[PDB]
Design a protein around this ligand. Structure first.
Ligand code: CLA
Ligand code: CLA
Ligand code: CLA
Ligand code: CLA
Ligand code: CLA
Ligand SMILES: CCCCCCCCCCCC(=O)OC\C(C#C[C@@]12O[C@]1(C)C[C@@H](O)CC2(C)C)=C/C=C/C(C)=C/C=C/C=C(C)/C=C/C=C(\C)C=C=C1C(C)(C)C[C@H](OC(C)=O)C[C@@]1(C)O
Ligand SMILES: CC(=O)O[C@H]1CC(C)(C)C(=C=C/C(C)=C/C=C/C(C)=C/C=C/C=C(C)/C=C/C=C(\C)C(=O)C[C@@]23O[C@]2(C)C[C@@H](O)CC3(C)C)[C@](C)(O)C1
Ligand code: KC2
Ligand code: KC2
Ligand code: KC2
Ligand code: KC2
Lengths: 228, 179, 238, 193
């Protein structure tokens, strides 16, 4: 049973706590689908939120402390000394659009029957591995590298090691979620995360509106900027 | 009446009916009593939650209520009675009329009627459109129905405390004199 | 335990009295989990109050005699020295003059210990069960054996293993001494605090305990800028 | 009884016929066929009118001209109610003439609905079979044959949905007109319509 698998997985994550479902979301029949499909969805959501949260945490350290590439790019418009909330606000509107669009294309590839079936896998709600990003073996142009393990460093890893890696993924993702939203919360409700008091600056604006402020409308292309 | 649900440890496993209104109640009368209790409980739960949200300071509805006539959700104010006085008569009539249509649908559409041998409080449309309480077993569903009854009885006392604080000022403690 | 075993332990703690439950709180069924569960909870409450009270008695004696640590409490160019916490006043005033982070982290460390004790999986992993389920009434499990990710140097009880290889008779005698010492130490610490708040309440200690103005049963003082703290402290009480 | 063998029965009135006044019980079966045919015609006309009236209320109109002097926006300017009056006369006559052709061709089918045919099943090609008359065989309902993809049970469920939506639109369009006539009679309609 999917709930029995999630039971065991929770024990692996933390045997002291074990399963902690005060809301019974695994039991709730979301979309009318069965418990297996609902648990698949919930595990995929957990792993994805965690993944993006850890990426966001490292991005917070990179941007707010100052870590930029060199050359012509969206980097050249963000003011120097700008905090992590303002770097996203300062990159161009097209940069925001194309970042979100590339992320959307990656997720479309993730949930597409095409790539998942080419890899001999199924959707996470229909008897598949929750949180598995397929190789780009069904993309039309043969794609050089895959998203997960692009250099294939884990081609020969034990199934036990991979299971333990997924267990580490879930916990680290949850913790990174907590830390990243700690960074967010300290800027809008001061004195909410005691340790971050004085470190994270305050920000006025809506975080959860992606395109506000719309940002500069500069044209950074140089060699062949006919579209301006 | 002893086999009608709603009893709990708060009464001591026994029915709370000191005046003996259950003695003079038949099966139909008892079904009517339970149906009225369920309806009043649900109404009071919604009323208390709405009044607490509006008066407490929660983020109320953005935008206008009436573009023409210039009535705004913010402009209506946080006092519940003043808000229901300042909302347009068209809006009041509309709320009441939709509630009336739903009441008449609950009465007629549920063909096995709660008075004529049916389940009291079985308004068919207005329950669980997303199917949350679909896979619950009968035991937990009975537990949750008892939860509905208890919570709503408390809610009825709460809303009457609210209107008592508004009408008879300084009546209930933990309700500022205005409302 | 049971009432018979509780009576036997009372006899071993003071053979002259034996069982002394004028309120019959052992028969008072609270939590609705049986007399065994109730007696287990009461025994744990006695043992834990005793442990905290003897610890706080020694802490009160040490802090009230100007024996602050040499190192600092806060860090920075303007950090509250432990000497400044001493100079804040009497020991209760020292606690109230602590930084808010110091107070929060002290009480949350204690809370972590408490939930660690209350969890049944860690208790079972260390042996014995919850004190309301037949386990030893007062017994802190092993922070090592619980399986925390990083290897901790020492457990909370007996970090250096000095009571290790103790005779079982010595263990029972030691638990009896723990309960009795805690019983007296609760009166000791509450007598210190009562002399601090109400002068002359404990006649023996006269002028030997510093005064104190704020409520002692109030971990956060006016300096603690947290939600609702100032509103709570607005209205005082005897 | 023919009233016991139709799709219009819906759970909204229980699993039972909604004849409060016994109108269907006080008539013969032929009148029941006429009733079903007229009910479905009324429902369909009503939903056409309801969506059209909403479109007029929103001031939505085509880009162009309804005549050589009037603009679609111009004739829609006053509102949905006066829009029909402001329409040019020849256009009204043309709409009425094409509706006349439709309701004559559909009537002139010999299986009919009163005399041994399915009530509400308008013949999909009204103008076919007419001698010395030619039509381009654009079948009146499902000109592009959506319902062919459905199974029998699917289209039965959708016939039930048709009856429900037609009755709801019967209420709705008259709600629009009555709200325009008596202000505040239907409070959901703003002064725009
Ligand atoms: C326009 C781009 C785009 C597109 C097409 C999608 C598409 C999707 N996202 Mg989203 N997502 C986006 C941008 C986008 N995302 C971005 C920029 C982020 C942050 C980097 C996320 C973070 C994210 C998470 C964390 C989750 C989704 C999920 C989903 C799925 C359902 C969302 C849903 O029902 O929303 C409402 C309508 C779907 C595959 C959910 C999913 O996969 O559930 C299992 C989910 O949990 N997305
Ligand atoms: C609309 C109000 C309403 C109604 C219709 C009912 C109906 C019922 N309650 Mg009651 N009840 C209510 C409000 C109401 N309750 C409230 C707010 C509380 C909380 C204090 C309770 C607490 C309560 C308990 C603890 C129990 C019941 C039970 C019952 C049943 C008792 C049998 C009987 O003859 O009652 C008929 C009652 C009336 C016709 C009351 C009419 C109004 C009175 C006479 C005047 C108002 C009094 C005033 C506010 C003080 C019945 C289904 C018992 C049950 O579940 O039995 C199976 C049960 O155990 N109720
Ligand atoms: C059942 C009792 C009840 C009554 C008599 C009123 C009456 C009123 N409310 Mg409402 N309100 C209710 C319940 C109720 N409310 C509940 C349960 C909530 C949620 C906390 C709210 C939240 C709320 C807000 C935030 C505001 C009002 C406001 C108002 C006023 C204008 C009407 C309006 O737009 O309300 C809105 C009414 C509802 C949304 C109905 C409640 C939901 C019902 C039970 C159906 C269930 C739908 C479900 C939750 C949808 C999920 C998706 C009026 C005085 C406005 C005002 O003037 O404030 C000053 C306003 O801004 N109400
Ligand atoms: C006037 C019409 C009406 C009425 C009387 C109700 C009544 C109810 N709805 Mg709502 N509901 C309505 C319209 C209405 N709904 C509409 C139009 C929608 C579609 C957006 C919903 C979507 C909806 C959902 C998704 C849920 C409800 C639920 C509820 C409960 C409200 C709880 C509450 O007050 O939360 C105050 C906050 C109650 C059974 C809940 C329910 O039935 O739980 C099982 C629930 O989960 N409703
Ligand atoms: C957030 C931190 C935290 C947590 C989770 C706990 C948890 C607990 N403490 Mg407490 N305790 C704390 C801080 C905390 N303590 C601190 C800082 C101290 C000072 C050293 C103590 C000193 C202490 C003693 C001396 C005793 C407890 C007891 C208890 C237990 C009984 C709870 C109860 O029923 O109280 C009721 C809870 C509330 C009214 C909720 C208030 C919010 C429980 C394991 C008692 C116990 O184990 O009894 C068997 C007990 O004897 N605690
Ligand atoms: C371009 C290519 C052409 C293709 C076109 C396809 C096409 O047109 O298909 C035509 C088509 C189709 C089709 C399908 O074949 C398809 C495509 C595929 C196939 O598998 C399935 C079918 C189905 C066979 C159907 C159409 C049905 C229609 C139009 C139904 C319309 C129905 C309007 C109503 C009820 C209006 C109601 C108004 C109300 C209630 C008004 C009101 C109010 C308010 C004011 C709102 C609120 C107020 O409340 C208060 C006051 O509080 C109450 C009330 C009553 O006053
Ligand atoms: C000393 C003194 O005088 O004090 C004063 C002050 C004080 C205490 C404030 C007073 C008061 C008023 C009080 C206390 C009022 C209490 C009001 C109360 C108790 C109000 C309940 C609302 C419940 C709702 C809306 C629930 C909806 C719930 C819903 C929609 C569901 O159940 C749905 C669902 O769960 C199911 C069924 C299945 C699950 O799968 C999960 C889901 C989500 C799908 C008094 C009386 O004045 C006295
Ligand atoms: C920014 C995002 C991101 C972060 C921050 C992150 C961090 C960690 C950490 C560190 C805490 C560990 C230890 C870990 C471990 C594993 N990751 Mg993970 N990972 C991210 C992204 C992806 C994607 C896209 C995939 C993926 C996978 C796996 C598998 C499965 C191997 C297998 O069974 O073949 C294992 C063991 C693949 C998969 O199938 O996951 C179900 C897959 O497609 N990861 N991952
Ligand atoms: C109850 C026991 C206890 C435990 C188990 C514990 C564990 C950890 C851990 C590991 C899990 C870390 C990583 C950590 C880190 C810091 N602790 Mg901390 N700590 C405890 C107690 C106190 C007290 C009383 C104070 C304090 C402080 C600081 C400061 C900042 C100093 C500064 O202000 O420069 C830092 C960086 C002081 C303070 O001001 O905290 C804001 C302060 O007074 N801690 N502490
Ligand atoms: C403030 C803290 C504190 C103080 C000041 C304190 C003082 C005394 C005194 C002095 C008056 C004696 C004589 C005494 C004796 C014993 N204590 Mg003890 N104790 C404290 C804390 C704990 C904790 C957390 C545990 C514990 C235990 C034992 C055992 C083990 C017996 C065994 O191994 O069966 C024995 C013999 C452990 C246990 O298992 O007790 C059932 C255990 O978990 N103690 N303890
Ligand atoms: C569904 C109903 C319908 C059908 C089936 C239909 C068919 C045809 C055919 C093919 C058989 C031709 C050849 C034709 C031609 C013209 N139609 Mg006509 N028409 C319909 C409806 C309306 C409406 C509502 C209006 C209208 C009009 C015009 C004008 C504009 C003249 C002008 O510029 O003044 C011209 C020339 C407008 C009008 O009468 O304007 C005075 C106007 O409002 N029609 N119409």
């Amino acid at each position: 049973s999917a709930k029995a698998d999630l039971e065991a997985f929770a024990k692996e994550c933390n045997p002291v706590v074990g399963y902690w479902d005060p809301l019974g979301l695994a039991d709730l029949p979301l979309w009318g689908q069965d418990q297996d499909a609902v648990i698949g969805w919930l595990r995929h959501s957990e792993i994805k939120h965690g993944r993006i949260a850890m990426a966001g945490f490292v991005g917070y350290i990179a941007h707010a402390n100052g870590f930029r590439f060199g050359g012509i790019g969206p980097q050249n418009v963000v003011p120097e000394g700008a905090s992590a909330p303002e770097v996203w606000d300062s990159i161009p509107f097209l940069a925001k659009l194309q970042i979100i669009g590339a992320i959307g294309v990656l997720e479309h590839i993730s949930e597409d029957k095409n790539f998942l079936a080419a890899d001999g896998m199924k959707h996470y709600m229909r008897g598949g591995k929750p949180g598995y990003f397929p190789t780009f073996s069904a993309n039309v142009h043969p794609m050089p590298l895959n998203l997960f393990d692009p250099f294939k460093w884990s081609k020969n890893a034990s199934p036990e090691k991979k299971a333990k890696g997924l267990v580490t993924e879930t916990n680290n993702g949850r913790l990174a979620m907590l830390g990243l939203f700690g960074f967010l919360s300290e800027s809008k409700i001061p004195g909410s995360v005691p340790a971050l008091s004085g470190i994270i600056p305050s920000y006025d604006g809506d975080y959860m509106q992606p395109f506000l402020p719309t940002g500069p409308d500069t044209s950074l292309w140089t060699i062949g900027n006919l579209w301006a | 009446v002893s086999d009608m649900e709603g009893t709990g440890p708060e009464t001591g496993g026994k029915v709370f009916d000191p005046m003996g209104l259950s003695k003079i109640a038949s099966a139909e009368t008892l079904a009517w009593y339970r149906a009225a209790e369920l309806k009043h409980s649900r109404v009071a739960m919604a009323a208390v939650t709405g009044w607490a949200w509006v008066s407490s300071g929660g983020p109320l509805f953005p935008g206008y209520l009436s573009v023409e006539q210039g009535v705004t959700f913010e402009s209506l104010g946080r006092d519940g009675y003043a808000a229901w006085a300042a909302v347009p008569e068209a809006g009041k009539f509309q709320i009441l009329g939709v509630i009336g249509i739903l009441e008449i649908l609950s009465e007629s559409a549920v063909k096995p009627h709660y008075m004529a041998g049916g389940t009291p409080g079985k308004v068919p449309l207005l329950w669980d459109p997303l199917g949350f309480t679909a896979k619950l077993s009968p035991e937990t569903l009975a537990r949750k129905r008892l939860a509905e009854l208890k919570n709503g009885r408390l809610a009825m006392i709460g809303v009457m405390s609210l209107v008592s604080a508004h009408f008879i000022p300084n009546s209930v403690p933990l309700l500022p004199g205005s409302v | 335990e049971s009432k018979a075993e509780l009576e036997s332990l009372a006899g071993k703690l003071n053979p002259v009295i034996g069982y002394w439950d004028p309120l019959n709180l052992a028969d008072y069924d609270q939590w609705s989990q049986g007399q065994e569960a109730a007696i287990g909870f009461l025994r744990h409450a006695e043992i834990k109050h005793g442990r905290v009270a003897m610890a706080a008695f020694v802490g009160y004696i040490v802090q009230s005699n100007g024996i602050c640590w040499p190192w600092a409490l806060t860090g920075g160019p303007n950090g509250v020295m432990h000497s400044d916490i001493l100079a804040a006043g009497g020991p209760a005033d020292q606690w109230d003059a602590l930084p808010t982070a110091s107070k929060l982290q002290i009480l949350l460390f204690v809370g972590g210990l408490e939930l660690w004790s209350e969890n049944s999986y860690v208790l079972g992993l260390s042996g014995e069960k919850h004190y309301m389920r037949g386990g030893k009434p007062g017994f802190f499990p092993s922070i090592k054996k619980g399986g925390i990710p990083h290897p901790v140097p020492f457990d909370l009880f007996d970090p250096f293993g000095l009571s290790k290889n103790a005779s079982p008779e010595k263990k029972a005698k030691g638990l009896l001494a723990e309960i009795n010492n805690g019983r007296l130490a609760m009166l000791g610490i509450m007598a210190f605090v009562s002399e601090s708040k109400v002068p002359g309440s404990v006649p023996a200690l006269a002028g030997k305990i510093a005064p104190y103005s704020g409520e002692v049963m109030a971990p956060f003082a006016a300096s603690d800028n947290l939600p609702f703290v100032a509103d709570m402290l607005k209205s005082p009480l005897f | 009884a023919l009233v016991d063998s139709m799709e219009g029965v819906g759970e909204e009135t229980g699993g039972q016929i909604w004849d409060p006044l016994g109108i269907s019980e006080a008539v013969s079966d032929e009148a029941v066929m006429w009733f079903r045919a007229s009910e479905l015609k009324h429902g369909r006309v009503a939903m056409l009118a309801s969506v059209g009236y909403l479109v007029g209320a929103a001031k939505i109109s085509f880009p162009g001209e309804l005549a050589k002097g009037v603009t679609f926006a111009s004739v829609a300017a006053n509102g949905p109610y006066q829009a029909w009056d402001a329409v040019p006369q020849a256009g009204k006559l043309q709409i009425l003439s094409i509706i006349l052709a439709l309701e004559w061709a559909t009537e002139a089918k010999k299986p009919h609905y009163m005399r041994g045919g399915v009530p509400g099943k308008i013949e999909q090609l009204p103008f076919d079979g007419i001698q010395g008359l030619w039509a381009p065989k654009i079948k009146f309902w499902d000109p592009l044959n959506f319902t062919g993809a459905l199974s029998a049970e699917q289209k039965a469920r959708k016939r039930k949905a048709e009856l429900k939506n037609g009755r709801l639109a019967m209420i709705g369009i008259i709600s629009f007109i009555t709200g325009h006539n008596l202000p505040g009679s239907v409070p959901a309609l703003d002064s725009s319509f």
